[PDB]
Amino acid sequence: FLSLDSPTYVLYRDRAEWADIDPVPQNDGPSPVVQIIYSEKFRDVYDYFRAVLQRDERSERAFKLTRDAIELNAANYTVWHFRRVLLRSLQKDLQEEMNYIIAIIEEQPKNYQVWHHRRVLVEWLKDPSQELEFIADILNQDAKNYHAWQHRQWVIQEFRLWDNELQYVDQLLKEDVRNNSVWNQRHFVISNTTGYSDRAVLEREVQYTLEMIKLVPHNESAWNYLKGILQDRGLSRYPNLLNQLLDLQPSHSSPYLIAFLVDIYEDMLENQCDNKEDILNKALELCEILAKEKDTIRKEYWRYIGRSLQSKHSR
Amino acid sequence: PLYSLRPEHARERLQDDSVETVTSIEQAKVEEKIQEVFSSYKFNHLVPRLVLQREKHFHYLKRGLRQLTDAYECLDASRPWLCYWILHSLELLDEPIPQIVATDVCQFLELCQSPDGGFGGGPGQYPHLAPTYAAVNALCIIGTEEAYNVINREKLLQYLYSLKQPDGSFLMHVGGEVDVRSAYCAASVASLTNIITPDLFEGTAEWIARCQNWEGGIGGVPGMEAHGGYTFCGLAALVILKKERSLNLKSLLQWVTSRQMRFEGGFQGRCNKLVDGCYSFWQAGLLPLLHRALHAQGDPALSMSHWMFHQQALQEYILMCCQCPAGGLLDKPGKSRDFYHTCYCLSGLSIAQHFGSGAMLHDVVMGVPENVLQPTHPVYNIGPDKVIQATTHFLQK
Ligand SMILES: CCCCN(CCC1CCCCC1)Cc1ccc(C(=O)N[C@@H](CCSC)C(=O)O)c(-c2ccccc2C)c1
Numbered sequence: 116f117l118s119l120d121s122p123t124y125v126l127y128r129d130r131a132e133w134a135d136i137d138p139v140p141q142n143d144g145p146s147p148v149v150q151i152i153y154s155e156k157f158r159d160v161y162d163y164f165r166a167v168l169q170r171d172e173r174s175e176r177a178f179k180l181t182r183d184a185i186e187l188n189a190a191n192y193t194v195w196h197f198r199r200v201l202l203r204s205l206q207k208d209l210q211e212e213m214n215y216i217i218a219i220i221e222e223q224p225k226n227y228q229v230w231h232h233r234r235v236l237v238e239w240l241k242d243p244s245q246e247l248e249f250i251a252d253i254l255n256q257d258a259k260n261y262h263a264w265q266h267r268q269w270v271i272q273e274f275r276l277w278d279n280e281l282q283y284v285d286q287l288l289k290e291d292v293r294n295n296s297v298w299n300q301r302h303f304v305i306s307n308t309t310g311y312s313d314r315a316v317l318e319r320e321v322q323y324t325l326e327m328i329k330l331v332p333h334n335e336s337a338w339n340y341l342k343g344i345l346q347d348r349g350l351s352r353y354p355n356l357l358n359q360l361l362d363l364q365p366s367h368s369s370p371y372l373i374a375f376l377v378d379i380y381e382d383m384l385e386n387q388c389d390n391k392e393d394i395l396n397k398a399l400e401l402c403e404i405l406a407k408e409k410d411t412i413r414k415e416y417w418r419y420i421g422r423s424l425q426s427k428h429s430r
Numbered sequence: 431p432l433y434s435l436r437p438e439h440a441r442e443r444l445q446d447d448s449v450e451t452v453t454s455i456e457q458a459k460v461e462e463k464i465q466e467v468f469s470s471y472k473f474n475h476l477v478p479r480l481v482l483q484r485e486k487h488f489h490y491l492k493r494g495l496r497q498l499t500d501a502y503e504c505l506d507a508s509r510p511w512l513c514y515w516i517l518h519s520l521e522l523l524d525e526p527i528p529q530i531v532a533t534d535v536c537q538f539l540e541l542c543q544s545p546d547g548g549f550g551g552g553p554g555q556y557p558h559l560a561p562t563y564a565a566v567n568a569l570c571i572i573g574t575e576e577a578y579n580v581i582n583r584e585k586l587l588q589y590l591y592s593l594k595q596p597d598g599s600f601l602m603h604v605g606g607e608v609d610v611r612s613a614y615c616a617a618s619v620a621s622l623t624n625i626i627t628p629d630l631f632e633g634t635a636e637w638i639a640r641c642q643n644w645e646g647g648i649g650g651v652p653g654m655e656a657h658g659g660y661t662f663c664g665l666a667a668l669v670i671l672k673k674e675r676s677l678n679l680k681s682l683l684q685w686v687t688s689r690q691m692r693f694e695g696g697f698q699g700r701c702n703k704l705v706d707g708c709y710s711f712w713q714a715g716l717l718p719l720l721h722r723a724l725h726a727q728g729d730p731a732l733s734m735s736h737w738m739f740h741q742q743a744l745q746e747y748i749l750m751c752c753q754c755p756a757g758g759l760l761d762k763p764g765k766s767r768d769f770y771h772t773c774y775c776l777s778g779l780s781i782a783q784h785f786g787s788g789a790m791l792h793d794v795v796m797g798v799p800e801n802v803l804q805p806t807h808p809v810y811n812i813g814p815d816k817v818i819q820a821t822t823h824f825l826q827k
């Protein structure tokens with residue numbers, strides 16, 4: 116019934132309910148390597164875990180024993196394995212479990228096994244009701260926990276739960292427009308619901324994107340998303356895009372723009388356009404500013420867009 | 431002077447557009463501590479600590495390799511990695527590994543290896559492609575009739591076939607998860623121990639592609655944000671699978687490149703996220719691959735001197751912001767050193783120092799001439815020679 120942190124906690128050898136079994140010292144061989152000096156409490160638990168695992172004992176006591184083997188190292192997939200087992204056999208209450216895993220995850224969110232263990236439970240109960248809210252709370256401590264988002268994408272696909280996600284995305288968007296993860300979330304909720312082929316849809320987004328662009332000129336997300344949802348069809352397909360981006364040179368310049376243009380001019384040089392000679396330099400020019408001025412660190416790269424574009428546009 | 435130090439380099443600072451969101455703030459704080467480091471030369475700056483603690487990281491590695499405090503209790507189930515980082519890191523730094531440990535290491539890994547293929551976090555744990563990778567990718571650094579024999583290539587294959595899924599991607603461990611990370615391990619391993627059947631990764635290339643999102647990079651699993659670690663996995667797996675071109679290489683390059691910080695000099699695993707040493711390999715590890723990609727594809731433009739990233743500004747970061755006084759390397763200034771970083775933080779230096787696209791070669795060793803590490807294979811992150819040896823071995827079977 117105890118805990119590993121309660122003062123009244125006792126090792127297992129010093130226990131009754133655990134005296135009818137012998138511990139299994141981890142054999143690290145005669146001459147150990149990368150060996151750990153496990154604390155008394157820790158080393159003890161596992162010596163006992165093994166003994167169980169090794170005896171495939173599907174006991175109610177082994178179960179509790181796991182919780183502890185998990186606290187000592189919730190990253191131990193083996194212990195997690197033998198746990199689901201005990202859940203299977205002892206036929207444990209799974210909500211009783213959900214409550215436990217919500218805890219743990221809340222505690223060690225940057226973990227793998229603790230998440231995947233929540234997915235397993237969920238697909239078992241076939242009930243994701245709790246999910247969207249949970250994940251959300253996790254995301255409210257770390258608006259960027261990979262796992263959290265991933266777990267969320269799954270929970271949304273497997274259970275067709277879109278309806279109120281695009282709102283969510285918009286919400287967190289206010290909170291921190293720079294959140295690249297959220298931006299990826301958007302293009303998940305759209306490409307999978309309405310898609311961007313829709314004239315109104317692609318229209319709507321691009322507009323808005325640009326909005327966030329003007330509001331915060333250096334938000335490298337807004338830009339990657341603008342180039343993101345318009346790159347497949349090619350940019351040469353949307354002429355107006357080249358003019359609007361020009362009304363930003365003043366109080367809105369940003370190397371995030373300098374490049375978009377170049378990018379644009381690239382797609383243009385790939386679609387027989389008028390002035391197949393006026394752009395080819397109007398851009399090779401813009402590659403200079405980048406490598407030598409605005410975005411020098413990426414000089415090596417730019418000094419390749421330059422070469423590439425020349426290498427295939429001359430004589 | 432050093433690029434990172436240069437005066438006008440303080441133009442590449444953060445412009446938050448007079449706006450503020452957690453991302454802004456955090457990036458802000460980092461830029462502070464990172465600046466403080468560079469500026470920290472105003473009083474004396476003759477022979478800068480632009481040194482690489484060869485001997486200092488060595489104690490950390492030499493010792494940590496034989497015993498680790500109760501602190502490492504969290505790696506309890508990933509012990510073979512703790513071997514892999516160290517053995518590698520040494521090779522990078524270049525310290526011959528004592529032929530007596532050689533056995534012990536092997537004798538150890540032989541104890542994790544499940545009777546049902548693959549290896550385990552430690553003695554008596556279920557097989558799992560991460561340690562299994564670590565272990566095998568480790569045994570190969572040792573490259574001895576002893577290491578090579580440790581691996582039960584027969585069973586390894588069966589294990590692999592078990593994690594094998596329909597859509598192509600493999601599970602991580604039995605009943606575990608799935609993400610590029612998985613495929614890379616399978617590939618990395620199978621190829622080395624040359625155990626690939628024409629029906630193993632059937633579809634896998636196809637899947638690793640469904641991973642490349644709208645950002646040109648790759649994500650854990652389809653639909654997930656672009657991430658450098660997974661990306662390396664995805665690409666590398668495909669360089670093995672000989673499918674590079676299956677992706678949108680141009681949409682990819684564009685991204686990686688944007689992953690370098692226009693200030694610090696290192697990389698960020700994801701757009702709008704703090705910089706981080708280990709990614710110096712995860713991200714910058716990509717270009718040496720993307721190179722083999724294009725060149726193969728038949729592209730002129732490709733340089734003949736460097737990789738497509740600021741190699742200097744990277745070393746200029748790994749050196750001034752990632753080394754520990756005590757020893758070992760780390761994430762960003764003021765962060766508990768650990769054998770992981772100590773590994774990938776260096777692998778990320780070898781990358782930035784060496785170039786070998788074609789029969790030609792040209793290094794760029796920043797700091798003192800005593801900072802040149804041994805080469806590191808772009809796809810396995812192990813002796814570019816221990817790799818050739820490894821394969822040129824199992825093949826005879
Ligand atoms: C802000 C979040 C940081 C995530 N980060 C973990 C940092 C670790 C580094 C090592 C000392 C303790 C802190 C990176 C990371 C991501 C995924 C994995 C990863 O692959 N995930 C598995 C690794 C299983 S090894 C059996 C997991 O169970 O968590 C790993 C990794 C890699 C090798 C060994 C141990 C670990 C944690 C590290």
Ligand SMILES: CC(C)CCCC(C)CCCC(C)C[C@@H](O)P(=O)(O)O
Nearest residue numbers: 224225259260261262263611659660
């Ligand atoms: C195992 C590999 C070959 C590569 C792993 C690369 C990584 C550093 C993976 C990063 C995992 C992610 C998505 C981040 C998590 O730590 P979190 O969701 O807490 O942000």
Ligand SMILES: [Zn+2]
Nearest residue numbers: 706708709761
């Ligand atoms: Zn890191």
